[PDB]
Structures are given as C-alpha cells and as structure tokens.
Design a binder for this molecule. Structure first.
Ligand SMILES: *[C@@H]1O[C@H](CO[C@H]2O[C@@H](C)[C@@H](O)[C@@H](O)[C@@H]2O)[C@@H](O[C@@H]2O[C@H](CO)[C@@H](O)[C@H](O)[C@H]2NC(C)=O)[C@H](O)[C@H]1NC(C)=O
Ligand SMILES: *[C@@H]1O[C@H](CO[C@H]2O[C@@H](C)[C@@H](O)[C@@H](O)[C@@H]2O)[C@@H](O)[C@H](O)[C@H]1NC(C)=O
Ligand SMILES: Nc1c2c(nc3cc(Cl)ccc13)C[C@@H]1CC(CC[NH3+])=C[C@H]2C1
Ligand SMILES: *[C@@H]1O[C@H](CO)[C@@H](O)[C@H](O)[C@H]1NC(C)=O
Ligand SMILES: *[C@@H]1O[C@H](CO)[C@@H](O)[C@H](O)[C@H]1NC(C)=O
Ligand SMILES: *[C@@H]1O[C@H](CO)[C@@H](O)[C@H](O)[C@H]1NC(C)=O
Ligand SMILES: *[C@@H]1O[C@H](CO)[C@@H](O)[C@H](O)[C@H]1NC(C)=O
Ligand SMILES: [Br-]
Ligand SMILES: [Cl-]
Ligand SMILES: [Cl-]
Ligand SMILES: [Cl-]
Ligand SMILES: [Cl-]
Length: 526
C-alpha cells in the first residue's frame, strides 16, 4: 500500500485493530534534517526523492535530556523517548482508517514535555485506535526541544527562537499540502496537545503563519498564559549567553557565538542546558517560546486580551490533581514511595521551592488562602494544599482564564474537568488524578480490553473519544447517542464546565472560583 505525496512516494504498513484494519505511515520526513549549518535555524522544506520512502517504523526522537529521577519506574520512564535520539528527528506519523476514507477529519497531536523533552512515538500517543474507532486521520510530529529547538538571540536568524514551534508549523503545512492524498480533508484539521503541547496549540491560535493551517484546537492541561509557557526576551538572552559561557562559546559578535555552538556536539549543549537558570524550580522551562517577532508578533498576553487570535471553537480542560506530579521532583518531605504527609513547616519550605523569587508577603498570602481547612485534623491537609497550590497556579487557573478571555470574543468554548484516576496508574494514590494521565483515555487505550482497565474505563474512554472526534468533525463535543449529559458552552458569565468521570457526569460552574481570583487578579500584584 503506497501513497504519492508532493515530495515522493511513501510506503505504509497495515495494522490489525479491533478486528479491523488501520494503515500506518510512521516516520515520514517533513523537513531537511537541521544538521550542521542548519542547527538552531528554522526548518527548511524538503527536496524531492525518486525512491519509495519506507515509512514503516517510528523515526528518531529529537535530542533531549532524559528523566532519570526514578530508574526502572514505569511511572516516569513511560514518558522517556522510545527511539534513538538524534538531531535528525523532524518526522511525522499518519494513521488512516481502512479502507481509505473519502474526506476524513484530521487530528494533529502535539506532544508535551515542558519544551525540553517529548516524542511522538510514545505508546500513549498511538493514533491507531482513534483511526479505527472514529475513522478520523491522526497525525503526530516530532519537533525540536530544549536549546536545539528554542535557543533565542532574537532578530538574529542564526538562532531566532521558536524553531520547535516552526517545526510544528511546517508539519501543519505538510498536512495541508499532502493529507488529501491519504483521504484526509485539509479543511477539517483539529490540533490537540497536552501541557507544553497544549501551550503550543494555543500559540498556533496566535501565530499568523498558522492561521490557515488548521480549523479547531483542543488544549489539554496547558495554555500560553501559564507562568511556565513563555520566556521573556531578556531572560532568553541571558540563558543563551549563559549556555555560551558554559560551553566556551562566549564571543563578542553574537553571530560568532552561534557558529561556535553549531560545532559543539549535541551532548555538550544538553549537559549544559540545566545550568542556564540560577533560580531553578520543578516547573523551570530552560529554553522555550519567546516573542520572536515572526511566529509570535507580540506578547501573547496582549494579543489574548485584545482579541488578536484565530476565531474558532476551542476545547479546554484540566485534571483534578495537576500539581502532584511535580511535588516529588523537589518538594521536601514528598516521595512516590510514602504517603508524603508533610507538616506546616515543610509546606512553607515547599513554597520557597516553587516560588523562589516571591516576597514573604506573597508566600504568606498563598499560605493564608490554602489553609482554610474543612477539617483541622486531617494529616493530609498540607500535603494536598501544596499540590493544589502548584496545580492551580501553573495549570488550572491559567487554563480557565484563557478560556474566559477567548470566549469573550464571541467563540464557542468548552471546558472539562477530568477527575478519574486510572486503575493502572503506576504512581501512588496520594497523587490522585495526575497531570498527563487523561491522555491514555483520549487516545482510546482503555478500549483495548487486553490491558486491564476497568469496563467503566472503557466506557469513559469510548465517550471521551466520541466527544473529541465530534468536536474535530463538527465543532461540538457532544456524545449524542448514549443519552449522555449535554456539554454546555463555556461563557464568560456563567462559566459552565463538564466533569469527566466513570461514576457520573455533572455540569458545574466557576471551577476553583476563590483560588483563581487569587492567582489571576491578586497574586500578580505581590
Ligand atoms: C517520604 O520519603 C521522603 C524521602 O525518603 C527518602 O529518604 C530515605 C532516608 C528513605 O526514607 C527513603 O524512603 C527515600 O530514599 C522522606 O524525607 C526524607 O527524610 C529524611 C530524614 O528522615 C531526610 O534526610 C531526607 O532529606 C528527606 N527527603 C526528602 C526528599 O524530603 C519523608 O520523611 C518520607 N515521609 C514519610 C511520611 O515517611
Ligand atoms: C543573568 O546571568 C547572570 C549569570 O548567570 C550565572 O549565574 C550563576 C548563578 C550560574 O547559574 C551560572 O551558570 C550562570 O552563568 C546571573 O547572575 C543573573 O542573575 C542573570 N539575570 C537574570 C535576570 O536572569
Ligand atoms: N522542565 C520540565 C520537564 C518536563 N516537563 C515540564 C513541564 C512543565 Cl509545565 C514545566 C517544566 C517541565 C518533562 C521532563 C522531566 C523532568 C524531570 C527531570 N528529572 C524535567 C523536564 C523534562
Ligand atoms: C521497503 O519494504 C519492503 C517490504 O518490506 C521491502 O521489500 C523493500 O526492500 C524495502 N526497501 C525499499 C523499497 O527500498
Ligand atoms: C471535502 O470537504 C470540503 C468541504 O469541507 C470540500 O470543499 C471538498 O471538495 C471535499 N473533498 C472531497 C469530497 O474529496
Ligand atoms: C558577525 O560576523 C558575521 C560573519 O562572520 C558578519 O556577517 C557580521 O557582520 C558580524 N557582526 C558584526 C556586528 O560585525
Ligand atoms: C454506546 O453504548 C453501546 C452499548 O451500551 C456501545 O457499544 C457504544 O460504543 C456506546 N457509544 C458511545 C459513543 O459511547
Ligand atoms: Br509536560
Ligand atoms: Cl522559567
Ligand atoms: Cl477538587
Ligand atoms: Cl495546622
Ligand atoms: Cl453521562
């Protein structure tokens, strides 16, 4: 089975899924390998090839530092790359239903990883289930991360910043030019991603170069107005110059620094990426999106506030316990192997870890707002409070503020609150409904009865898969057949959202009302 693209013929492989067939094209190149003189530059378009590219396996993952905090632990190694690391990594994957669809809606996945790590070949991003069940076309791409994808000396075309975002954008360009040959509809393309991938998706709503490359957007546990999402240009310059000094590349002529870094081998850059920031936190984004004046023409907060974004429908949501995952990466008294019951003192030292450059009054304000106990006696109180502090500040409240600002300019928005803890979650119970563990349900992994998800989890995954596909195809995330509850539009006034759980489903209003008033209105003033 062979498909002719604008740059050459590609050969896929047939897969058996749920008694049916899905055709997979793994590892299709979409740019020149950013090697040598092309390192740190924007991605270059492909040149023709006369042969047949055998797109039969996942391609290389981009260079990145691997999470080594828990060796042998599936809870952390599930996120580590499962293919070879290489600078030659800008490839994409396409899952098409069998037989070839006529005009199928396309879903483009942008993985997360704090803009430092990630790859499209992860088991939990396997798009064959969605292609099998909803007969949509799933596309995922690899984009450069870390310094190799986001180092910025702005205005300098040798290292202008946002290369990884331009990598994603060139992949969307590829879908627009080629997906029709796979039976796809280039006019029905929905981007979706998680965490830094969701922040990437939200930035594509702002980028002028991305306006006509997709139709709708889904933002899972992330948005560009999150505190970790966008680095200022003065911060980007210091961290670029800091990396230069650590590698012996400090030159006067800024163009010379880049060429020096272009001749350091990738691992010297990787080992030094960690030390470019002096005030580290578990949510530190060493090299990330900047206002480059090309992909991003202005400060994203300004464009969001004044309505300069693509007018379309969005699907946004968060998980119940977004913050717990980061506590075991620095917070004192916390561990994945005990119940992490902390004292008031350890809670306060935890605030210093996550809010290092915040005044003493600002941290007393955080403490005051998160210690109005329902029950004074619960030993879990400070443990769960710091989890809620990290989760609301870094994910939930930014996501809610984005959805409210976006809907204020007339577009339909839908907000969800995912609150089911996976029965196969390798992390301890106290970490709850963790950041990143709605992804398996979105991609339909519980529909595979071979894994021992509950039957309730298969039903929940089946319903979420239908809502996601219905949003991509029709702009409305309803599940109309099985007498579900209707998902109402999120409006700036009432602010309704939908809970996703195995037990029931409810329409609620004003999620984290008191908490997000503090983080979004008051806390920026301290
Ligand atoms: C939950 O575990 C943390 C960390 O536990 C690590 O430290 C070992 C001493 C051992 O307990 C093992 O479980 C693990 O490798 C506990 O915090 C630690 O407490 C000790 C003193 O008791 C300090 O010296 C450590 O620096 C400190 N580590 C961290 C990361 O804070 C914590 O006490 C424990 N909680 C409960 C309720 O048991
Ligand atoms: C600008 O850079 C200054 C130098 O960074 C060094 O700081 C050390 C503490 C260590 O991290 C070295 O690896 C760095 O090279 C730093 O002191 C300033 O604070 C920076 N200013 C800002 C605003 O970030
Ligand atoms: N800096 C980050 C990292 C990751 N995600 C992040 C998510 C956010 Cl919102 C912010 C920063 C992140 C995923 C990887 C894991 C870790 C742990 C390293 N032991 C640091 C990197 C790499
Ligand atoms: C591609 O795969 C086919 C089938 O496995 C194989 O016969 C062929 O030699 C491979 N290489 C090509 C076509 O260059
Ligand atoms: C796919 O749908 C679009 C409208 O969304 C239409 O313009 C186009 O002709 C269709 N292509 C087909 C049916 O091949
Ligand atoms: C830096 O060097 C490049 C090439 O070596 C040159 O084109 C550029 O003008 C130099 N910059 C300055 C400020 O001289
Ligand atoms: C609706 O329920 C039936 C059986 O109860 C199930 O087979 C089907 O997959 C469900 N559909 C959705 C969209 O959940
Ligand atoms: Br992440
Ligand atoms: Cl940061
Ligand atoms: Cl809650
Ligand atoms: Cl107390
Ligand atoms: Cl329901």
């Amino acid at each position: 089975i062979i498909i002719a693209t604008k740059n050459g013929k590609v050969r896929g492989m047939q897969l058996t899924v749920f008694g049916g067939t899905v055709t997979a094209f793994l590892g299709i190149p979409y740019a020149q390998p950013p090697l040598g003189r092309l390192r740190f530059k924007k991605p270059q378009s492909l040149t023709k090839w006369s042969d047949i590219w055998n797109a039969t396996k996942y391609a290389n993952s981009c260079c990145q530092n691997i999470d080594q905090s828990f060796p042998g632990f599936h809870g952390s190694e599930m996120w580590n790359p499962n293919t070879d690391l290489s600078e030659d990594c800008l490839y994409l994957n396409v899952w098409i239903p069998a037989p070839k669809p006529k005009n199928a809606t396309v879903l483009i996945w942008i993985y997360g990883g704090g803009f430092q790590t990630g790859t499209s070949s992860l088991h939990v991003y396997d798009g064959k289930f969605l292609a099998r069940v909803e007969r949509v076309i799933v596309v995922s791409m690899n984009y450069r991360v870390g310094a190799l994808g986001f180092l910025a000396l702005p205005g300098n075309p040798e290292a202008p910043g946002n290369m990884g975002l331009f990598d994603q954008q060139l992949a969307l360009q590829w879908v627009q030019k080629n997906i029709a040959a796979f039976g796809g509809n280039p006019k029905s393309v929905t981007l979706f991603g998680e965490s830094a991938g969701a922040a990437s998706v939200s930035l594509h709503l702002l980028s002028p170069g991305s306006h006509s490359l997709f139709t709708r957007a889904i933002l899972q546990s992330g948005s560009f107005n999150a505190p970790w999402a966008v680095t200022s240009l003065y911060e980007a310059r210091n961290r670029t110059l800091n990396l230069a000094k650590l590698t012996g590349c400090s030159r006067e002529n800024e163009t010379e620094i880049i060429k020096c870094l272009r001749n350091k081998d990738p691992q010297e850059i990787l080992l030094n990426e960690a030390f470019v920031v002096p005030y580290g936190t578990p949510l530190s984004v060493n090299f990330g999106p900047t206002v480059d004046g090309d992909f991003l023409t202005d400060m994203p907060d300004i464009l969001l506030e004044l309505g300069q974004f693509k007018k379309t429908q969005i699907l946004v949501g968060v998980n119940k316990d977004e913050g717990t995952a980061f506590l075991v990466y620095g917070a004192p008294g916390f561990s994945k192997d005990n119940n992490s019951i902390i004292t008031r003192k350890e809670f306060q030292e935890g605030l210093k870890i996550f809010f290092p450059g915040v005044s003493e009054f600002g941290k007393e304000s955080i403490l005051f707002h998160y210690t109005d106990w329902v029950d004074d006696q619960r030993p879990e109180n400070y443990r769960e409070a710091l989890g809620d502090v990290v989760g609301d500040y870094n994910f939930i409240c930014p996501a809610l503020e984005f959805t409210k600002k976006f809907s204020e300019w007339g577009n339909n928005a839908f907000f969800y609150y995912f609150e089911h803890r996976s029965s196969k979650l390798p992390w301890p119970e106290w970490m709850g409904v963790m950041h990143g563990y709605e992804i398996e349900f979105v991609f339909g992994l519980p529909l595979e009865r071979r894994d021992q998800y509950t039957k309730a989890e298969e039903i929940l995954s089946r319903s979420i898969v239908k809502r996601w596909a219905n949003f991509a195809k029709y702009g409305n995330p309803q599940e109309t057949q099985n007498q579900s509850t209707s998902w109402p539009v999120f409006k700036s006034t009432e602010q309704k959202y939908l809970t996703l759980n195995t037990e029931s489903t409810r329409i609620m209003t004003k999620l984290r009302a008191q908490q997000c008033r503090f983080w979004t209105s008051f806390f920026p003033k301290v």
